[PDB]
Symmetry: D2
Subunit: 112 residues, 4 copies
């Protein structure tokens, strides 16, 4: 039940298809729509533990380019009240002299 539409508190949403390959494809949301791609464990444990996954978005589309990219690392918790809990990293292009301020960290919980 990863496949579907997910919403986050700050009002971002995304649409993903989970393939049998372990591939993740979709969009993160026209001028605000970006391509997403990632991977998940297509054979998780059945001991109650969640399903590890991660995905990337580059913040460039045919309308805008913020010269940066975000990655989300987390797990999927299934059932009726399904959730994806993540932590993310956002890196912007910078000079070497200013690389030390190039990466933000944060967290986000998604609901279906």
């Amino acid at each position: 039940g990863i496949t579907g539409t997910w919403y986050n508190q700050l009002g971002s949403t995304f649409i993903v298809t989970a393939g049998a390959d372990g591939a993740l494809t979709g969009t993160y949301e026209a001028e605000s729509r970006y391509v997403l791609t990632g991977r998940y464990d297509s054979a998780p444990a059945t001991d109650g533990s969640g399903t590890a996954l991660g995905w990337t978005v580059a913040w460039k589309n045919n309308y805008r380019n913020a010269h940066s990219a975000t990655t989300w690392s987390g797990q999927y918790v299934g059932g009726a009240e399904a959730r994806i809990n993540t932590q993310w990293l956002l890196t912007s292009g910078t000079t070497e002299a200013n690389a030390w301020k190039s990466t933000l960290v944060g967290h986000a919980t998604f609901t279906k």
Copy 2:
């Protein structure tokens, strides 16, 4: 200059193809140690001397093993004749909700061509 073969501090290698649309596709070998990678990058970076932002994902499942884990690498590409990728990474393992708090490792890694 992203397309190609990269090696890091202790024995990891990946082969990556950077596509016009901005896709990153390739293979990550942690040493049978090969795994699928996929990610995104800025295919129209600035020309003021800044680096090129990118990120990628590896889920540690191949046909030979499954670690119930995935790592994401976030960083930037730096050209030159000393071309490199500086990243920070997050590694999340599948856990029980009770153990969620210790689900995620953080680290950094530099890669060379």
Copy 3:
């Protein structure tokens, strides 16, 4: 403002004093009601915050060693104090364990935590 007792719904509390000189001093109780769950906290905070509605930057550290136990590890929380009818402190944390250099790649966990007064 910051001075007082703070709780995280997962069964943890801390008592702190925010000093005139930017210092944070108190005790962290890992497990509500458990006296052997108590550790020294120390930190720093911005004693002259912006008055534009911004929160107050702060940080503290706890090494997980006391008279009772030693986990060979330390956590640092980085975040901000946000005033309101219900005051909160929003943080990101790092937990580092001692390891050999061979295992250093797995020495540090990252997470987040919110505390309410």
Copy 4:
């Protein structure tokens, strides 16, 4: 072992005293307007198996001369030897409005040399 003067790449220096109590005290910097107070904790009885010593400290970027309305925390470990080093991951948080809270925290890493 930890007590002493430490250097990292960028050009930053910190002077610290490790107390018997697990206390870490010192300064992050010798000109005064670049000088900030640090406090932290360390594992005062590390494992005896080759492991490093866990430690952490905090700096609030306010002094008599300036205020950046932010704070950095360093989390890492000390590794002894004649090439002793401190390896750290860090978090820098700035005070923001409700609206900017999502970008209030930077992460990085840093190695310090004695």
